Symmetry: D2
Subunit: 428 residues, 4 copies
């Protein structure tokens, strides 16, 4: 059951269709890699949910009230105030997006422990329930090795579990020790756990993760692109919070980190925006230090690469993103897609918040090892219906990512029928 | 089969849900007349497709570039130019909406036949394939009787037919002769035919109509609210035009009127806007005359009650409304609604462009006819799913009118499921007195 | 002294320049009537402050959140609520603009006194401190004579006076008695007094007027286009109110009418919008009656010809229009214009809220009166600087009406410099016949 | 003479005023540094013209037509096409702003010459007519020393000259040699020369600069924040181009660089945006390489940190920014401010494109050496009128920077009267 949209549609961007002849030539042209296809050659564009979604009327309003002031803008304060009421975090630095909160927090947090505890850079390891590609990429650019301490269940697309994104507690505790605490610059808590497919992390797990971090005085950065979807799964699956509001769960949730880095272009539903925030005074020093570096990289920490409107809009998106009907609707669409695909013998991970991971390796096991299974299917899937999706042994899963409030159930049915044509011609 | 939207969604307005308890109070409080329910209390609002539907990004962008000049705005010129390229019509008066062009043309065209052909005001009768409520209303306010000359097939929710909107040609020809051609102030060609349930009028019919009117020198006005939908139907059903484009079909169509009066709030997709345009120099007089009256009623005829951005927006709206993928999708969503309802045994009219019309008389057969049954169905549909629909003897059909690019196949299902529950319960359903 | 704008500028519309040669052709081609010049050909457009002026960011943002529901929109409710908090008025009908509330209230209030007090339609006369063109026009279309009861000072561009807008109180009292109180359908309290050049009407005057009307049970309608400007003048000039806020002055003011009809296109700063509101339950009847007529003329009385975003926008417009820094700046820019012109020897009326009125009769003294001299001045001002101004015997004053937050002290200077060149050349200036 | 605005005003952001009492407490609070004052405490905000200006109706329209597509957006192409027609440059990479085109071009250009010609990083020097603070800052972060080869006239606020931003040709030629060509990773041509006050660079100078760069095969990056104002001065002051249109002059101008880096938040009048573009195939390799690094830092090179709308808007701002009446108006306002200030004995640099540099050192020569002359005056200037301006021996000039189409002549007169009060109480 696809829930009815708890909204009226208001502004649409028209899309043209393409001949089968035409997409063949597009797919060679951007040579066997959907990633480099032209937007206009794509009907249903599932490359990513990042910044590709609808906004609300209020968000659109918000864009028209920007204070474009270089230092100390009222729009900066409007944004910082949303962060205060939602996460209860006293310190806000806007950034243009995630890719860029990371470029700041990471060198600061390494320098910090370096000064205060003799972190040895050649020996430093950071931890996460699972590092996102950018978070990882940037950790390594700063010379920091990373380890994922996820739970045995997480990538096993064959079995179901309520919070597959959780931290392996034994593993994190032992990692920290084998490495030494002085050389762990930070732990990142990814909610939802993006890389296992948007698999959520429960409150009980976050609390216990934070007890360990506390015991060794390791900063905890909450990677919050999909903070709202995570809350919804907690409301839906964790017995103790069944009656909590999403806001209430967010506030409890964020007690178990020291700071947050967020690409706003996901759950907070903005075409553009990011946040790097600190909870309290204990981190004022880090906040000061991240301000300096934000200057160099984004621009003055009162806009941090955002125009006025963007800050006004984000200040509103953080609310609209947490709407209960909204989440229930968004999450069920994904769930409906996945259900739809399981029902025709296309094996998928457990449905997460924002995307449907098809185990491409299983759909075409005759298409061999080192011939990139998903890529091949993704190419075919584009060839048949004008559907763009990408994939980037753990698991090679093709990744149907759903922009928020963008496509309808008819589109979901459309992805389904296409897959049925692919599967039913997969002997190639 | 519901076609997939040919559009990414871009802006959404959130809607909150209500509880049966609350809706029981709302409908009492808004005296058993869905019409007077508040927006907030309504989940799916099927009251009207007038001004209730999505705009495209280009339209929204157009609202940002209005020339607010009080006389001779470029935006007015932008609007006039679309009318020329689309309908081939030389003369243009923006008005705030349909209700408002009608207020102008009606008195002017009655005055004209008074002076020119000696019209008897107290004998006068205007003709149409079927007059819309506001067109009737206004015709009547200026003292003019109205007569609908539809074909027997039109309101018959039993048989199907390619163009139920057509003018009953003999009937029109006869009425004109029976009444006196001098006392016929005008003919209104309503396209699509609203009241029949959005049924099309074919080109061939419009040619034959126009000929009758030319034979008597009767101005013909094209009521143009749903011109795009009509063209689409002409292209789907009229053999002669299968390979034409919606634009070319629209150009060809307007050869068979003398002027157009348009609620731009329907097919042109705008929250506000209307038009009053004349075709060529033969009607320069009426145009001048209509300008004078517009000043009085709407404002200087170079904005006619519209802000700059609205003229800009309509200038774009006229184009996007004609999009082939767009119309095919729109018309198809409505068809899907009708098919879903017929399939659960709810007898509808033949699916038109914009709305499913439900024979409330049939779904609820024991409800005495004089206890307005469609009203009762309406109230019931609200109590059950928070869907607003309204009815206002050819019939009393409850009218499910779909706003454009607003609701999804999921909402359609919802509306169907609700009717399935309403049908399952007809025996406890409440007449209304 | 021109105060500095209390605002950063945010969006600009570029304007191209023209050459004397080109303007010589434009004004011929648009038959020596600046009125019919195209927007594009005009550098400074001083035709009207109606709908031609800047909006604030909040207003523009408001346009993005319209509830396009056809009945009971939240935006309608947002609008009604501002009217309650601002004017203290319980009943609200959006209309597309002033022209459009007038069309409603006039017939309703004539019908009322016909039935209730036995009004003679062919004897009836409406009164005002001074009736605006469209108010006159409409009053007259429904068969009602109009009489202006201004004080001798009003049009006298010689002496100054704090409130030239005032009702000639004896005159009103007498006219009512002279005509029969039964045949007085209504009194219109126009604030500020447009035709006098935007001159204020004081609270004390409005109290004394309202008393006369209460003595005869005559509905009083507040013509409210420039209510904000009036309040500002009351605060600057009326001793009693120096320490009041514009809002409190507005609340106090509206105690002395029964209903308001407003072109929101002026002080409320919106490109489009109007209002028709009644004060309390004593006028519930008229309100109901006005609703019915609005359906017919503007549309269902819950949008009354306005899109959702317009209701949202006006809901905000009413507030921002009352800003103290805003008004002081606005009123001061006009004053600066007047002072610049008097200083180069161009005799103006006393500076009102929105416009400088230039005594074209005096600047050009040998131009025979019957060769419309203000027109000729207008045409001349266009030939010389590409400034559009218009005139439409108490006078023939050319009317330089300044759109809000649109032009700068630099444009004011420009307008002055042009008049300095026009005065320098009066002997070769062309009468017009 | 202040030219009349060649525009009607359309949307205004209201501003409140403040008591003298109140600004005293604001100025201590953000302790003796206007830079950190709250936007709402500022009436006339001249901290910078960067992203603080009006937009046109068409730009605002443009924001409503974004294609928010992650890869290959039609808005990306719309933007790249403006760059093509205006500068004639085949390669476009959007970036969120200037600060960030620099973070890319610089390491790429150093690596390039390092591979191809044995640049020695410990010996590398880059050149410019004058390096902007960010361009410099980022050159140094990558270990690159910088030298300015400006002409003797440039900072001498006492004398006037038609193109004070020009490259010292002898100096650049000799620098290159003393350093060795293999260790000059790039030359940056700043138009206008921001740091000498917006002093323009003539076409003849750019042509001859480029002949030298050619002779030694050194990449030339045109730092183009104020490309349009520069064109206008060329049209106004260089005999040979009196009759050229601004577009025509821009096209000629850009023949004398290999690539461009631009903060769009200045002449192109966008609240947000940047460009890193390459002229032709000879630089395709650099373009490819800058794409990669843009991924890491801004996001995919098809948006590069910009939302759809931003790209649409920039694609339009690059035109609207070059409008002839617009420039003549903007430049004369500055000129009018400056004139106004010279006329009351406040000594200023020659008026540039975008800002008025007051020689603070001269206005208060009793306020000593190491007590930051401008800071002190800027504090006072804020204390008196609610005017924010900042200053960051060469020259210590307080820097009144005018946002585009934001303030009116009455505001200019207002800055003037304030300065008259400051000057006339400067014995403190």
């Amino acid at each position: 059951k696809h829930l009815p949209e708890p909204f009226r549609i208001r502004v649409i961007e028209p899309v043209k269709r393409t001949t089968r002849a035409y997409r063949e030539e597009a797919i060679i042209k951007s040579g066997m890699n959907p990633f480099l296809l032209d937007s206009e050659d794509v009907f249903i564009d599932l490359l990513t949910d990042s910044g590709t979604g609808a906004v609300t009327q209020s968000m659109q309003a918000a864009m028209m009230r920007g204070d474009e002031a270089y230092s100390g803008s009222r729009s900066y304060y409007a944004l910082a105030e949303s962060v205060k009421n939602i996460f209860g975090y006293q310190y806000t630095i806007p950034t243009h997006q995630g890719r860029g909160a990371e470029q700041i927090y990471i060198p600061v947090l390494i320098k910090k422990r370096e000064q205060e505890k003799g972190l040895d850079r050649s020996k430093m390891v950071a931890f996460s329930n699972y590092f996102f590609d950018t978070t990882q990429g940037h950790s390594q650019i700063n010379g920091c090795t990373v380890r994922n301490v996820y739970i045995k269940e997480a990538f096993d697309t064959g079995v179901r579990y309520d919070f597959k994104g959780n931290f392996d507690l034994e593993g994190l505790e032992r990692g920290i020790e084998e490495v030494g605490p002085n050389n762990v610059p930070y732990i990142v808590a990814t909610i939802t756990s993006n890389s296992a497919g948007g698999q959520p992390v429960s409150l009980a797990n976050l609390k216990a993760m934070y007890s360990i971090a506390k015991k060794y005085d390791i900063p905890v950065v909450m990677d919050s692109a999909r903070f709202a979807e995570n809350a919804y799964f907690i409301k839906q699956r964790e017995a103790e919070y069944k009656d909590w509001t999403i806001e209430q769960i967010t506030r409890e949730t964020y007690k178990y980190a020291d700071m947050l880095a967020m690409s706003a272009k996901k759950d907070a539903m903005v075409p553009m925006g990011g946040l790097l925030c600190m909870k309290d005074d204990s981190f004022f020093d880090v906040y000061t230090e991240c301000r300096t570096l934000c200057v160099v990289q984004e621009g003055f920490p009162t806009y941090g690469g955002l125009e006025g409107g963007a800050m006004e809009r984000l200040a509103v998106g953080l609310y609209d993103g947490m709407n209960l009907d909204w989440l229930a609707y968004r999450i069920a669409q994904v769930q409906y897609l996945v259900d739809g695909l399981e029902e025709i013998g296309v094996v998928c991970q457990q449905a997460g918040g924002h995307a449907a991971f098809v185990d491409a390796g299983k759909l075409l096991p005759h298409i061999p090892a080192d011939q990139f299974p998903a890529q091949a299917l993704a190419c075919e899937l584009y060839k048949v219906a004008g559907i763009r999706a990408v994939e980037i042994c753990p698991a090679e899963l093709l990744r149907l990512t759903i922009p928020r409030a963008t496509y309808t159930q008819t589109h979901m049915d459309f992805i389904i029928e296409a897959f049925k044509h692919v599967k039913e011609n997969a002997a190639n």
